[PDB]
Homo-oligomer: A and B are copies of this chain.
Amino acid sequence: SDKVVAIIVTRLDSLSENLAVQTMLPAFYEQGYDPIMMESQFSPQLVAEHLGVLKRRNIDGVVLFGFTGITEEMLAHWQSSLVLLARDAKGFASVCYDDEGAIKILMQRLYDQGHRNISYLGVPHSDVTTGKRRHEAYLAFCKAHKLHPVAALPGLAMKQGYENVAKVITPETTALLCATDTLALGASKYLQEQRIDTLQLASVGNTPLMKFLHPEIVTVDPGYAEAGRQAACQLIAQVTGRSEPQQIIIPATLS
């Protein structure tokens, strides 16, 4: 009888995900739904378990933070009462980010500032959005502006950024684009230690931690706050029959 929605994040300690969750919560409370959280840790098996538990407890709707391994078949019992965040699936409502647009905007900014030797610190191509799309957008920009690409794809963790930044720092390098704020935080620790002050850093996130600690890093906002509001509203709209599933892309903005 109580209206309940579930939010399935991949990581409870992810700042990027928490920023989207922060705007979902007031929108759900205003709609009369009490929100509950669950964590997947990128496991499709754990997601399949959560979904069954939620179904048997008659939960009204689900906001699922998508990742590689989620199949349409495991989302079958939730077609009309589920919204995917960060990934899309045919016949499902989704709220996605503009990864290519985020990288092109950042690369243009660095290029207009005079930077020609810009290195990249990213995540492996198995991670479709943060990894593949972001890295390929960097490559497409380098190709179009006859720049020499220098990249390393260690992964998501701050410590991975710290351990692999030296690999992409060359004598001619003046700027470093990090696929995530977390990676920029790790890379920044190494540069501070080695007393490298000459490098302009750039990252995707615009998280409050990044803004506070490194005001000098150029950041691009993927729109986590907006994504959260949209996902909550799309979910309530379809569970109340006011809307059919839509696929929304949040535009990236600079500063």
Contacts of A13 in B (CB 8 A): 15, 18, 22
Q: Which of A11-37 contact B (CB under 8 A)?
A: 12-13, 15, 18, 21-22, 25, 34-37
* Shortest distance between the CB of A63 and any CB in chain B (Å): 13
A213 within 8 A of B: yes
Task: Decide if A53 touches B2 in the complex (CB within 8 Å).
Answer: yes
Closest B-chain residue to A19, C-beta based?
A: B13
- A57–B35 Cα distance when bound, in Å, is 14
| Residues in chain B near residue A15, CB distance under 8 A | 13
A126 to B50, CA, bound (A): 38
- For residue A2, which residues in chain B have a CB less than 8 angstroms away from its CB? 52-53, 56-57
Q: Count of A residues near B, CB < 8 Å?
A: 31
Looking across the interface, which residue of chain B has its beta carbon closest to that of A58? B57
Asked if A248 is at the interface of the complex by the 8 Å CB criterion, the answer is: no
Contact with B along A148-166 (1 / 0, CB 8 A): 0000000000110010000
A38: chain B residues within 8 A (beta carbon): 34-37
Q: How many copies does the complex hold?
A: 2
Are B189 and A56 touching (Cβ within 8 A)?
A: no
**B25 touching A39 by the CB < 8 A rule?**
yes
B53 touches A4 (CB 8 A): yes
Shortest Cβ distance from A49 into B: residue: B34
Shortest Cβ distance from A50 into B: residue: B34
Residues of B within 8 A of A213 (CB): 185, 189
Q: Is the CB of B159 within 8 A of A212?
A: yes
Q: Is there a chain B Cβ closer than 8 Å to A255's Cβ?
A: no
Chain B residues lying within 8 Å of A57, measured Cβ to Cβ, are 2, 4, 57
A1 at the interface (CB under 8 A from B): yes
Looking at the assembled complex, report how far the CB atom of A249 sits from the nearest CB atom of chain B, in whole angstroms. Answer: 26
Docked CA distance A145–B30 (Å)? 54
Is there contact, CB below 8 Å, between A37 and B53?
no
Q: Which residues of A contact B (CB under 8 A)?
A: 1-2, 4, 6, 12-13, 15, 18, 21-22, 25, 34-39, 49-50, 52-53, 56-57, 158-159, 162, 185-186, 189, 212-213
Cross-chain pairs A/B with CB under 8 angstroms, 5 sampled = A12-B18, A36-B37, A36-B38, A186-B212, A189-B213
In the A-B complex, the 6 residue pairs with the smallest Cβ-Cβ separation, listed nearest first, are A37-B37, A36-B36, A2-B53, A34-B53, A13-B18, A57-B57
